[PDB]
Design a binder for this molecule. Sequence first.
Ligand SMILES: CC1(C)CC(=O)c2c(nc3nn(-c4ccccc4)c(O)c3c2-c2cccs2)C1
Ligand SMILES: CC1(C)CC(=O)c2c(nc3nn(-c4ccccc4)c(O)c3c2-c2cccs2)C1
Ligand SMILES: CCOc1ccccc1-n1nnc(S(=O)(=O)c2ccc(C)cc2)c1N
Ligand SMILES: [Mg+2]
Ligand SMILES: [Mg+2]
Lengths: 335, 337, 339
Amino acid sequence: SIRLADLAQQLDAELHGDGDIVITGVASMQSAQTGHITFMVNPKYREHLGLCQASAVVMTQDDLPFAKSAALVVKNPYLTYARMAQILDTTPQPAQNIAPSAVIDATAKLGNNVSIGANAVIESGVELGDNVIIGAGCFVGKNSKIGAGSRLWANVTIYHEIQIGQNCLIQSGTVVGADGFGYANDRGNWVKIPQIGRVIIGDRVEIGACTTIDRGALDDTIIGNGVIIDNQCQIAHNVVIGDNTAVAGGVIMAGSLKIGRYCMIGGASVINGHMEICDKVTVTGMGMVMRPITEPGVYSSGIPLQPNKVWRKTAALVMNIDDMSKRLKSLERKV
Amino acid sequence: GSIRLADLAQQLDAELHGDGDIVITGVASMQSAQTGHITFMVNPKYREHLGLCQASAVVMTQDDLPFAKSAALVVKNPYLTYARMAQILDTTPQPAQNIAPSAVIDATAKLGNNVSIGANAVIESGVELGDNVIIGAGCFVGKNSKIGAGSRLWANVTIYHEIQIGQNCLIQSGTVVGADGFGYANDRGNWVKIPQIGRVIIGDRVEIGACTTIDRGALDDTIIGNGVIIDNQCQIAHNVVIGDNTAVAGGVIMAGSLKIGRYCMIGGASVINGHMEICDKVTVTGMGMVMRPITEPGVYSSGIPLQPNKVWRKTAALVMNIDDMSKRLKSLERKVN
Amino acid sequence: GSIRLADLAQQLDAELHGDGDIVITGVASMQSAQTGHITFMVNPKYREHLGLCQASAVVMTQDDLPFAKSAALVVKNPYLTYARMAQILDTTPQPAQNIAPSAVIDATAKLGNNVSIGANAVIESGVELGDNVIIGAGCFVGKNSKIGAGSRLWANVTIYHEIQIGQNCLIQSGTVVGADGFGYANDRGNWVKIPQIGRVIIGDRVEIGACTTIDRGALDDTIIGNGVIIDNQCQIAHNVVIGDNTAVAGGVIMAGSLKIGRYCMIGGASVINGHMEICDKVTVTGMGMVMRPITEPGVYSSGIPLQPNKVWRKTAALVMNIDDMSKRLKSLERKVNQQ
Ligand SMILES: CC1(C)CC(=O)c2c(nc3nn(-c4ccccc4)c(O)c3c2-c2cccs2)C1
Ligand SMILES: CC1(C)CC(=O)c2c(nc3nn(-c4ccccc4)c(O)c3c2-c2cccs2)C1
Ligand SMILES: CCOc1ccccc1-n1nnc(S(=O)(=O)c2ccc(C)cc2)c1N
Ligand SMILES: [Mg+2]
Ligand SMILES: [Mg+2]
């Protein structure tokens, strides 16, 4: 809980109202009650602010005349919302103290204020930085290094020789450093190629749940600083992702793909390998990415939903589009 | 556990034709069934094949009865009766029995009667487990989460904090309920985390497959209705609401703030956009690309299916250049008219 | 792990040119290789670059040998020899060593010789682990399941009950084998669970990636043939049958009762529908949308690739209206036919 005037100061917001109001948490505009702060981005909500029951509303200067409560004026309410949700965050930590049921190899090095959850398993040679938190049931493999401030939720798997920077956060079920999908072929029999490269994750990387990031075959899989990756993603061996790129849920990447900085990869996209995507590329959802992308901008693919009756005809005609093309050529000749 | 055929038929509300004292030990497919097994016939083309079936009894309809070559249970719906009798004769073990000495259970957790918790499970402070709840080995149940009577988690399931799960649910291994939604604000190209302080509310009789992820809401909640079934490796993003009795097949990826109505059927590998609504009684066939809201019930589909690669190369190129085809068609229409 | 270059060459059936007494400590890429490393060349474009490589030895072909600037191992297939030498020099640790005091192992479990079980792994009643089996930290292996000699599970792998795994398999973390298939009857809109009392049968020399799921069968079994390789994030539904040596790339989804033949190659993120068969020696390129049986070998593809968004918007609109384009074409043909 925090006085509104204090909160406004920390947010660098211009306060219009009673600064002694006590704010206990953040809430949606439709749910907010006394003690909650909320925010608005869409002008459509101006007319019904009299129905919002928040103690304070974050808004812009143009919104201020419509205010029906204490207001914090800022240029970017959504960004301010993020900041104030961090100030008022209620999320617990994955662990506190070192659990006696954890199994920690005698050669592991733990920094100051490290917490390790129940039944977590820490291999030989691991290095955990100051303030690192390892959730219950995690596995951290041999010689892996996790930088200060980083946190794993429960049941995360880190393989061996992995490097993770500072202030990262990895959600449960995720696996970092599994073997890449590397095989030679001897008369139809697959021959495993040991995957002896690593994964290097930079600082401030956030990874969702049940996501897999494979180790490289010889050199490394690299996740740059500030990257955010959603749930259910596959990042194959020797992928390289530039700083601040965002990868939405269910994206599948093939090996040796290089993605630049400030990219936005839409959910359920499929990105083929041994190719590069330059900085500042957006791929919209379900994109089928087969070719290098050399110019910034927004790219898309796919034929979207239709009523089944209509789709049946759409699909048949597209599958026979070569015949259509020939009929059009023939008609052009006759004319 | 074995059961007399008469007693089985009574529990199934079936008409017995044959020896009620036959002892049934389990369910089997028509081709695999041996003595002691009960099986079922849904396809009348097998009527002539019943003499080759070595089951001790066969579930069938009244129209099938003259074709029986064994004890028969006559029902209106052999498939539904199959489901019921497989439940009665289920050999599936429980995820755990009793409370394992290797489980780590906070002193403030509230355990109901007949709760079982498997080896090395971890139960946080304030957790409430209702009567007959079973937690598999290696599970994690985060702070203050509540699991209703009769619900069961297989091994290695992760439940985060402040999650609510109703009664008689079943969650398969690897599933994660309540991870942070994918919430970030952008500040001059840098991502700023938005804490996800909503929850997940899961209703009664919900079944969730393996390695599915259901993220907690940003402020308000992610909600799964009663009787919902969700297959493996789905992503249900923050603030999705799924209406009662909807089915979601495997590998479906949903964006945030999608609302799905009751009695929908979402085919495997579909992709669904967010901040929009799908009404009740919508079916999306497999791999559906659902970009826009669906306001009318019925069946919807997308996608161009497989062709020989040589063919596909031309199909793809011609489609990508379809605007040129369109212009040539218009130009030819003007030339002819 | 260090080995003399002459002995490595003998084990690789390679022709040594250079100092057999050189000590090789590991494999490295051509760009990263340093003293003590062996590397390989598959692209002759790098012949002029070999003077810049600091490896102690380079695997190459007879045609490459005159361009060597180091000890050389001459072989017919440098890529295959790389795979073999990376195995000889593998630095990958084992998932576990010996039996961890924190593992919870049912008294009725049967262990072969030289079995290792990692910390906090849980082994149910009736489980059988063959010789040299390694169970990683935190795994679960359910009742009566059998894991054959030489097979290894990384950490946090889940095996359900009555599962059979062959010899020399490798399963990466987060994978779940034997969960319930998606089986339900329907009583007036209410789903009625069908217990899934079939199993999963996995053959010998199967490799499975991370966070992959393979459901048990409803009555009959889900079957994975010998020598199959399966990538991360795959979904193999109940009663799927996969033939020997087939390869499944990452993110593939297979629906129930699909039968795939031998020596198939399924590209990443493909979607294969069920109750149908794919014959031997079929390749489905990535993101393939497989709706019908495939009865002939060869390569099959689907999908319209990426375009600039503004271009895609027009493409999609025209395709969605392609039936009107068809009707206009037929109408125009009729006019040119003078009818
Ligand atoms: C719940 C039920 C008893 C009935 C049902 O409707 C259904 C079931 N299993 C499915 N598997 N796949 C699938 C899985 C992976 C890839 C491709 C397809 C579907 O699409 C499935 C569907 C549906 C079909 C159309 C809408 S939902 C079993
Ligand atoms: C098994 C092998 C040694 C050889 C192989 O054939 C193969 C391999 N890795 C792949 N990754 N992806 C992929 C992954 C994610 C997104 C898109 C594509 C494929 O499609 C892959 C394929 C195949 C190509 C065509 C059919 S299978 C390595
Ligand atoms: C599906 C998961 O998608 C996300 C998850 C988290 C964050 C952003 C996205 N995301 N990515 N692309 C889009 S989309 O609107 O271009 C889109 C295009 C086509 C379809 C069928 C859906 C969505 C969204 N909403
Ligand atoms: Mg323990
Ligand atoms: Mg997918």
